[PDB]
């Protein structure tokens, strides 16, 4: 169970790990939906 | 075109908050231009009226 604290340990708190000493396999993470506007999409640019 | 813009402007009044009629961007004079440039000077007159 040591490698699965976030799946079987009742006392597991979100946001913890044992990274420098052990590698867990089931944790909580974030995911993103970034968008990448071009320069013209950022500012008011048109022809003269 | 039977002066469609004029009637559209009048009609837009009854539906403001749903549609807003605006002056065309190209109607504006060039920003870098100077007042001495007569064609640009005329534009402001119409733009103001």
């Amino acid at each position: 169970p040591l490698r699965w604290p976030g799946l079987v340990d009742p006392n597991y708190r979100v946001g913890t790990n044992d990274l420098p000493n052990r590698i867990t396999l089931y944790n909580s993470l974030y995911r993103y939906n970034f968008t990448y506007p071009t320069l013209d999409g950022i500012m008011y640019v048109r022809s003269a | 075109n039977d002066y469609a813009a004029f009637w559209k402007c009048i009609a837009s009044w009854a539906y403001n908050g749903l549609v807003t009629t605006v002056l065309s961007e190209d109607a504006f004079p060039d920003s870098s231009q100077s007042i001495t440039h007569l064609p640009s000077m005329w534009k402001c007159l119409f733009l103001t009226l």
Binding site: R13, G15, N17, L19, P20, N21, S28, Y30 | -
Partner: protein, 411 residues
Amino acid sequence: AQRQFFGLTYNFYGQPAPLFDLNDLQELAGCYARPWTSRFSHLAISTGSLPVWSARYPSVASRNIIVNTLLGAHLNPFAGGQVTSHQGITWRDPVLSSLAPVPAIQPPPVWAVAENVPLDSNNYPTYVLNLSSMWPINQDVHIMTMWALSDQGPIYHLEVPVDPMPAATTAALMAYIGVPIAHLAQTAYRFAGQLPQSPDSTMVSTIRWLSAIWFGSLTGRLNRSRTCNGFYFEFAKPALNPDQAVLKWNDGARAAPPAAAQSSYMRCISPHWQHQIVEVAGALMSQSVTAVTGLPALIDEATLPAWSQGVANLTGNGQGVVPCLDYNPVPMAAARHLQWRQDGLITAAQEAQLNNDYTAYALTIERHLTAMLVANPIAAGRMPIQPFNAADFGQAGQTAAAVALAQAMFV
């Protein structure tokens, strides 16, 4: 820009020498690289992605604490006007670009150890003459000072003008909507860090508002019900991990500006700050503004450790003195929840539940830290975490005054 600053080195907690070993320096400021903007290079969105839970540097604040102690051994030029060496290491150049072992032919004089050393920029003329390149020093020295002045949490400054927000700040904030606090704090640190700026700059006003909004939401005065020009912060559920906040914009009623300009200094009175990212980021972000604009006024000595009593250019007890408030997160959370119920966001049943969850969460932080201290006794020669006593987790501090300030700050 700003051609002058003042500073104060750390205090030794009874120990005879600054608290860091060679490996600390070798890792945190080695590689002959510039150490002057590294503070965020070892931070991320949340604790779950960080090694802060074990081994060396076993706390969120640990690395930055060590950095502050490290600088205390090498900032002599702003104290005595000369570059020195400590344990065989010194700056490579009068510009203080980076550290290196001492040369064998003409070593600089060895630094005489001392603590709580006052610092002036004027003591080292070459700094101003090279302000364009040595500018990053200003920010870090300020940050180091703002932490050194206090036990428990670092000190930072708050203020709100009587005017509405300018349009530029509004547009900028409208681009930072879905961003967590940690990323925002980085940009504030990045901005003021790398080149001189005038206080009359758009970003400076922007960050000033952010610190205000952060505190107002922290106290719970700013909510979905009541917002600052449409903005406010949202905090994560205590049931999972309350140590997270993001920016929001909303249709809620907008708070009126205060009758008169409000301002004060702040700090966390309890050790919880050492392992709580929202506290660290909030402090750093706020401290960044003061770094570029300088201290508006002297800080009140009334509630500060002994070494902070009457420090020149920093602390005072005279007329032109701004009081400093402090708070404990647990009573703060209870107040925030209470405000939510009064605003009608939640029911009384939920409010009771939220208090139970947050108290349980805080207990873990205390339990972790107190166990971590005995694992790293300060007598070992390095201080990864600031010392404290068990009773320090129970102090209510001036929390009641703090929420009163936000009450007056966002009417």
